[PDB]
């Protein structure tokens, strides 16, 4: 997208992750499988939950709103009431649709950001222990276990 991970250098998303929005497809000689990164997943979920809260909280509830009737010699104050009800309804519908286009784009920017921050975090651990091969896929120089994969997940693996 904007940052260049979602349909970017990482070609597509994997249905093998269900545990979280971000994850690692490990391909060990001890067996392959998927494992979600709980940190980037929960930071994204917390930021999305606060965005979902914020847009609903700013929408203070509509109380009893009823139509006003006017007589045959009150057509001006009828057209003032009509202009007021229409003009408010225009502004509320306009702000509701404008914000939706903006926040959907900003959320796709935010998720693309969270894949990028996770990729560079794993790349800075696999420095001269691996090479980049598949745009997300690293290929190790010394072949390490599922414990060493989990060490790369949890933010350790200090190896050169």
């Amino acid at each position: 997208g904007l940052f260049g991970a979602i349909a970017g250098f990482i070609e597509g998303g994997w249905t093998g992750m269900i545990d979280g929005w971000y994850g690692y497809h490990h391909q060990n000689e001890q067996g392959s499988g998927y494992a979600a990164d709980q940190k980037s997943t929960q930071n994204a979920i917390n930021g999305i939950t606060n965005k979902v809260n914020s847009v609903i909280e700013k929408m203070n509830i509509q109380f009893t709103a009823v139509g006003k009737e006017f007589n045959k010699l009150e057509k001006r104050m009828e057209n003032l009431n009509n202009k007021v009800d229409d003009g408010f309804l225009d502004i509320w519908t306009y702000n509701a649709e404008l914000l939706v286009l903006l926040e959907n784009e900003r959320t796709l920017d935010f998720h693309d950001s969270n894949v990028k921050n996770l990729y560079e975090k794993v790349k800075s651990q696999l420095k001269n222990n691996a090479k980049e091969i598949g745009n997300g896929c690293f290929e190790f120089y010394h072949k390490c276990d599922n414990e060493c994969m989990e060490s790369v997940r949890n933010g350790t693996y200090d190896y050169p």
């Binding site: 269900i18 690692y24 959907n104 796709l108 794993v122 598949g134 896929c137 190790f140 276990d145």
Partner: protein, 105 residues
């Protein structure tokens, strides 16, 4: 021993509109817009409304003979008319400050 960073996908055919692209297929979404209703008049917090029915405000308040079923109604949570609320004033003239009287009520 290889390790591949990626992101989630699923079977979800949810779509959203953005400034860049309309109807973008997404893994999860929620609607902030409401369209469902019961199709029924219901009690507003356990208290039933007044339904004027075949009558309007003026036929109930003056006590028009066709609006005698509305005369014992003491209390309500809201007042309701219908498109056929014609039993109002039953002898011609005018109701002075009618528009203000339904605004009081």
């Amino acid at each position: 021993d290889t390790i591949c960073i990626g992101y989630h996908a699923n079977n979800s055919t949810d779509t959203v509109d953005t400034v860049l692209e309309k109807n973008v297929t997404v893994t999860h979404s929620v609607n902030l817009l409401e369209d469902s209703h019961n199709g029924k008049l219901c009690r507003l917090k356990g208290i039933a409304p007044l339904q004027l029915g075949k009558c309007n405000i003026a036929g109930w308040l003056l006590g028009n003979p066709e609006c005698d079923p509305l005369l014992p109604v003491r209390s309500w949570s809201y007042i309701v008319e219908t498109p056929n609320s014609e039993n109002g004033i039953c002898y011609p003239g005018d109701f002075i400050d009618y528009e203000e009287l339904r605004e009081q009520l």
